[PDB]
Design a protein around this ligand. Structure first.
Ligand SMILES: CCCCCCCC/C=C\CCCCCCCCCCCCCC(=O)N[C@@H](COP(=O)([O-])OCC[N+](C)(C)C)[C@H](O)/C=C/CCCCCCCCCCCCC
Ligand SMILES: CCCCCCCC/C=C\CCCCCCCCCCCCCC(=O)N[C@@H](COP(=O)([O-])OCC[N+](C)(C)C)[C@H](O)/C=C/CCCCCCCCCCCCC
Ligand SMILES: CCCCCCCC/C=C\CCCCCCCCCCCCCC(=O)N[C@@H](COP(=O)([O-])OCC[N+](C)(C)C)[C@H](O)/C=C/CCCCCCCCCCCCC
Ligand SMILES: CCCCCCCC/C=C\CCCCCCCCCCCCCC(=O)N[C@@H](COP(=O)([O-])OCC[N+](C)(C)C)[C@H](O)/C=C/CCCCCCCCCCCCC
Ligand SMILES: CCCCCCCC/C=C\CCCCCCCCCCCCCC(=O)N[C@@H](COP(=O)([O-])OCC[N+](C)(C)C)[C@H](O)/C=C/CCCCCCCCCCCCC
Ligand SMILES: CCCCCCCC/C=C\CCCCCCCCCCCCCC(=O)N[C@@H](COP(=O)([O-])OCC[N+](C)(C)C)[C@H](O)/C=C/CCCCCCCCCCCCC
Ligand SMILES: CCCCCCCC/C=C\CCCCCCCCCCCCCC(=O)N[C@@H](COP(=O)([O-])OCC[N+](C)(C)C)[C@H](O)/C=C/CCCCCCCCCCCCC
Ligand SMILES: CCCCCCCC/C=C\CCCCCCCCCCCCCC(=O)N[C@@H](COP(=O)([O-])OCC[N+](C)(C)C)[C@H](O)/C=C/CCCCCCCCCCCCC
Ligand SMILES: CC(C)CCC[C@@H](C)[C@H]1CC[C@H]2[C@@H]3CC=C4C[C@@H](O)CC[C@]4(C)[C@H]3CC[C@]12C
Ligand SMILES: CC(C)CCC[C@@H](C)[C@H]1CC[C@H]2[C@@H]3CC=C4C[C@@H](O)CC[C@]4(C)[C@H]3CC[C@]12C
Ligand SMILES: CC(C)CCC[C@@H](C)[C@H]1CC[C@H]2[C@@H]3CC=C4C[C@@H](O)CC[C@]4(C)[C@H]3CC[C@]12C
Ligand SMILES: CC(C)CCC[C@@H](C)[C@H]1CC[C@H]2[C@@H]3CC=C4C[C@@H](O)CC[C@]4(C)[C@H]3CC[C@]12C
Ligand SMILES: CC(C)CCC[C@@H](C)[C@H]1CC[C@H]2[C@@H]3CC=C4C[C@@H](O)CC[C@]4(C)[C@H]3CC[C@]12C
Ligand SMILES: CC(C)CCC[C@@H](C)[C@H]1CC[C@H]2[C@@H]3CC=C4C[C@@H](O)CC[C@]4(C)[C@H]3CC[C@]12C
Lengths: 178, 178, 178, 178, 178, 178, 178, 178
């Protein structure tokens, strides 16, 4: 009767609202483009990229020789999901150590910001949740605040990086001999 | 009367909801691009690709000589079907053995992940359901976790592969002399 | 009155449903691309293509010399019809025999699959319903299962063919000297 | 009152149905592309194309010398009309005879099929309704069944033609010296 | 009240019907492309084109030398008007006579057909309503029936023309020395 | 109540009708392209273009040397206004006289037609309302009837002009030495 | 109840009307393209452009050498605002004086017209509201009436300018040695 | 009942209004393009860009040698947020001082205007909120009023800058030796 018609009309209104909300959520773009210059004097072998959030549509370049550039990119999961792209790239270095690069492009910018970090681990370590937590919570990550930051990585290596503050984040790092 | 009008309005609302759901289901893309480099010293002859899920729109390359690359791709079945693209590619090798490559790009990522595996079978074996089950459940498949994995295939052969974690999966494998 | 208004509303809903169904049925694509390599040592003269289902928009190439390739294609009938493209191509060979190639890309994949077959008939025979039934039900057709199949055709001829399992089917056959 | 509102709603529904039907009828394409190779040893002068159904948007080529090809095309009448393109092309030959080519691409394929015919008439005769009836009902036209058909035209002339079975019909004929 | 609401609904339905009808009427295309080859041995000077129906968007070429071609085109009046393009082109010839070419592409093909005519008038006469009536009703115009028609124009001149039967009419005439 | 709802529905219908009418009025195109060839033996200096109706989006070419062509164009005012493009172009000539060219492409073709005129005024006179009235009502303007018209301008000058009858009017004039 | 439903329907109608009105207001284009040729024998240094209405999206060219052309453009403020583009460009001249060019492309053409003016001020003066008022109300601006106007600027300088009457206004001025 | 239906209709109207408002807010563009020419005789090293409002999608160029140009751009935050792009770029100079450039393109132009400023700070200072407040409230910023402004920066340096008044702001500065 009248109640059923009102319920159906309300359901249709809720359906339209849900369609609009889902389209808006799916139209949100959170992508990261990582470019790392290798002036470290040693060849880099890709180990893995651990994605705490998001994913990548391309192959992680297996080898990055000295004087070359690692080019990589990722983005948030397809669909109306309120997650960004957060991850750690782990490359094996010729000296036997691991270069770890943390990137974080969050979905909700009301509570979170773009973050990035670079660190060198002794031995060959694959990027995982523990490495991400170390780089994000305990190793003093740099804010993606459209600023250049330099930090000595050790092992005769230093890093100079930059990351913008937008959702279309670009993380450019130069890892050079210290 | 009023009841019939309410029923028709509810049916129209359900029709609109069903149209939206079917369009969303059909817009989901699950495709796999397989690239296998042959540095095994022997020529590969295509046997078959068994698709547990999905299909392919191209011909499986009949011959892959040493130093060449097998390029292949597949995708999930057209239409609003909640299935991914899961399959095994079987190539005959010159020594008389079979190279089997398992790929798995699931539809529902809440329960499943991207998987891949590489194995060498003695004799000439065509890819089928049993081979897929062996490669997916009992031969320790590698997760498609944006990481490089290496494993000795035996018969003087080793494999080094990579697979991303997204629905637009790329599986790059190098099968080289051990 | 109220009954007439309800009937008209139901008719409009049925009209919208019918429009959506017809559009979906018409958007289904079932096409076949046939490529046959002639390494038989004899020239092929086109006889005819009998379409059990579907049709073709191009001319069947009249002559296919040795070392050349027959290129042909067909698709299902235009409009919202639940039929695929099923047919037999009959070519006359220089020795006086007929090369018959059966292709079958069904509309309903719930009950049917892609099928193909190659056979050589003594004498000059045009493709028709009987030839299609022979090739589809009694001459052991190969499944379009993304696999390479080889079969001796006789008369000093062998065939090696491939057909994928999708609705956008490609049938590649090489008919060579045995 | 209520009756008038119901009548107006029904009229609107009928208007929508009529619009959809007219759009579907107008979207139906029936076109014919005629290509006739002249290896008859004599020049052909265009006489006329009588369209039993449909029309053409181009000029009938006035002269077709020996070794050249007549290219022509036509289509069904613009608008939502349930008629195909049926006609006869009449060319004058140098010997004083007429080459008549019948083409028929019907609108309703439930009752009709593609047909074509080739004939040589003594003297100079223009294509008309009587010639079309002769070629379609009494001179054994060839079915447009994706098959090659050969027939001796007489006067030291033979014809070898092909016509597909689809609505986008192509009629390729070679009229050569017998 | 209810009557006013019914009247407004009927007015809206009539508005939608009128919009559809006007769009359909405006989408009807009736254009003519005239190409006249001058092999008369004398130069042609444009006098005027009298449009009984329709209009032209280009300049009538002032001079057409011997061995050149007059290219002209016209179309029906813009907007939803049920009129075709009917007119007479009058060119002055070097000998002091007038070449008049009548073209007629009607809007309603249920009652009318494409017509064309060619005539030579003594003296310099501009195309007007009387000339159009003479060429259309009393000088035996040729039907635009996809046929070639030849007629001696006199004054040592003959004409050979062709006109298709469609609304996108092309009228090709060759006026040569008799 | 019911009256207010009926009033609102009628207002919405009137709004839709008004939107359609305004869109149709704004889609009406009335533009004029003027091309004047100067074979008068004297240089022309632009004085002004007085637009009785419409406007122009380009600069009136300041100088038109002998043997060159003045290219100009205008159109009706943007928006749903029922006005055409009517104006007079006044150029100063080297001898000290003024060349005035009247063009008139009306909006309503039910009452008005395309008109054009060419005149030479003694002295330097700028185009204005009085000059337009003189050229349109008292100096015998030529109708834009797709016809070539010639008239001696005096001062050792003659003009030969052409103007089509459509709303996309082109006015081509040649002002040459008499 | 019924009153609330009527109020909501009226509010929706008003919303649709407001959306249409705002779209129409925002679709109105009022832009000015200024081109000033410098044949004054002195270099021009840009001082500023004071926009009484509208704005510009480009940089005012800092230097305009003798024999070069200043190219500039502006437009009305983005959004549905009923304002045109009115401003004064002030350039510093090498002699120590200021060249001021007033342009005015109004929004409402029912009350206003295109205006322009050129003046030379002693000393270096920046364009402001007072300069605009002087050039628009007291220094006899030229109407943008598709006419060429010349005026001696003084200081051994004269100006010859042109401005059309449309909303897509072009103001071309040549400032030359007197 | 009736109340619930009225509430649902009002909610739908509010939803449509909110969708329109959000689309309008998101369609507002506020971007800044900064171009700074370095004729200071010293190399510039990027320190950081502090965005009080908005963000940037590109990397701040690390080095700007003498005679080169810094190219940078930013825009307001994506989505329907009523914020502009306001920030300070801080570059390190070879002499040990900092070049700070303030840009401000506000969202609400009813209360705010485009502003810019250039200053040199002793020592190496990173752009932050305090620097922005200093440059915007206490160091006399130049208005983005389409005017060229010059100011001695000190330390043997002077600046000459320009900024337009539109939301698509361009800020061009030349920092040269004083
Ligand atoms: C009713 C149903 C409500 C369902 C709400 C689901 C919310 C999911 C948020 C993502 C998440 O459950 N968790 C996170 C994913 O967001 P992200 O990709 O931006 O990661 C955050 C960055 N960081 C480095 C991991 C900290 C995040 O916590 C979100 C929202 C906060 C709540
Ligand atoms: C009411 C009607 C409900 C109908 C539900 C149909 C669900 C079909 C799911 C696909 C499937 O029936 N089965 C599978 C196909 O999904 P897939 O292509 O991602 O394959 C899974 C990967 N794996 C390697 C085969 C394991 C899968 O099990 C789905 C969903 C889980 C339930
Ligand atoms: C109420 C009205 C219902 C009308 C249903 C019409 C169904 C027509 C199906 C096609 C068909 O009547 N018959 C067939 C055409 O499908 P196809 O093109 O895929 O051919 C099948 C393959 N094969 C090699 C010929 C076997 C087929 O049998 C369909 C459906 C099964 C029922
Ligand atoms: C209520 C109003 C119904 C009006 C129905 C009009 C149907 C017109 C069909 C075309 C036609 O009245 N007659 C024909 C035109 O179709 P065609 O162009 O395909 O020609 C047929 C082929 N042939 C060589 C001429 C035989 C044909 O007979 C159609 C339909 C059969 C009925
Ligand atoms: C209620 C209002 C009805 C208004 C109907 C107006 C019809 C106008 C038809 C055109 C016309 O009033 N008259 C004609 C224009 O059509 P045409 O351009 O095709 O010219 C016909 C060809 N001919 C060479 C001139 C004969 C023609 O008579 C139309 C229709 C016949 C009625
Ligand atoms: C209720 C409100 C009705 C408002 C009607 C306004 C009509 C304006 C017509 C243009 C005009 O008020 N006047 C004219 C502009 O049309 P035009 O641009 O085609 O100029 C006519 C040509 N001529 C050379 C100037 C004669 C013309 O008179 C229109 C219509 C006739 C009425
Ligand atoms: C109810 C709310 C109504 C709000 C109406 C606002 C009207 C704003 C008009 C612009 C304006 O408030 N004032 C002006 C801006 O228009 P313009 O850009 O064309 O400038 C006019 C040209 N001139 C050189 C400055 C004179 C002008 O006066 C408009 C309209 C007249 C009223
Ligand atoms: C009910 C909910 C209402 C919510 C209103 C939110 C308004 C946010 C305005 C932006 C802001 O909260 N604050 C500012 C951001 O705007 P902006 O990017 O143009 O910065 C202004 C320029 N300035 C150099 C920083 C001064 C500004 O104050 C806006 C509006 C004034 C109020
Ligand atoms: C009123 C009744 C029918 C309940 C309706 C619940 C709706 C509003 C809930 C149920 C499931 C929810 C979704 C569940 C998961 C996600 C993924 C997350 O990353 C973003 C939010 C999103 C997309 C939620 C949006 C809101 C949602 C659609
Ligand atoms: C309320 C009455 C009419 C029953 C309605 C049942 C509807 C909701 C059911 C019936 C058949 C169902 C479909 C059957 C098969 C598939 C393929 C699967 O891979 C994804 C889901 C999908 C696409 C289902 C979606 C839901 C579905 C359309
Ligand atoms: C219910 C009352 C108003 C009668 C409605 C009659 C309608 C359905 C009839 C009247 C005229 C008919 C049209 C008349 C002529 C043709 C051309 C033919 O080649 C195809 C069908 C077509 C296009 C008809 C379609 C149906 C039609 C539009
Ligand atoms: C019911 C009341 C409001 C009367 C409605 C009358 C309508 C249907 C009439 C009035 C004026 C008519 C138009 C007048 C002139 C022409 C130009 C002609 O070449 C084609 C028909 C066309 C386009 C008519 C179509 C039908 C028309 C719009
Ligand atoms: C019923 C009540 C609200 C009165 C409605 C009056 C409407 C129909 C009137 C009022 C103002 C009118 C417009 C006023 C001016 C012009 C410019 C003219 O060149 C073409 C007509 C046009 C565009 C008119 C169209 C009709 C119009 C919109
Ligand atoms: C009537 C009941 C449901 C309350 C509705 C409140 C609506 C109108 C309010 C709640 C939250 C508000 C938004 C909150 C934040 C922002 C960001 C700001 O930069 C622009 C305005 C904007 C986008 C607001 C627009 C209006 C808004 C959507």
């Amino acid at each position: 009767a009248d109640v059923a018609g009102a319920v159906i009309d309300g359901a249709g209104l809720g359906f339209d609202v849900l369609k609009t909300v889902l389209e808006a959520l799916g139209n949100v773009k959170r992508k990261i483009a990582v470019g790392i210059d290798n002036e470290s004097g040693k060849t880099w072998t890709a180990m893995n990229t651990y994605f705490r959030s998001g994913t990548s549509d391309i192959v992680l370049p297996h080898k990055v020789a000295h004087g070359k550039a690692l080019l990589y990119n990722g983005q948030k999961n397809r669909g109306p999901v309120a997650t960004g792209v957060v991850g750690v790239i782990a490359y094996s270095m010729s000296d036997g150590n691991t270069l770890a690069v943390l990137f974080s492009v969050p979905y909700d910018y009301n509570w979170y910001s773009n973050w990035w970090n670079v660190r060198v681990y002794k031995g060959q370590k694959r990027a995982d949740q523990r490495m991400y937590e170390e780089l994000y919570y305990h190793r003093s990550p740099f804010r993606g605040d459209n600023g250049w930051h330099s930090r000595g990585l050790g092992y005769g290596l230093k890093s100079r990086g930059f990351m913008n503050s937008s959702g279309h984040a670009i993380l450019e790092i130069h890892v050079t001999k210290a």
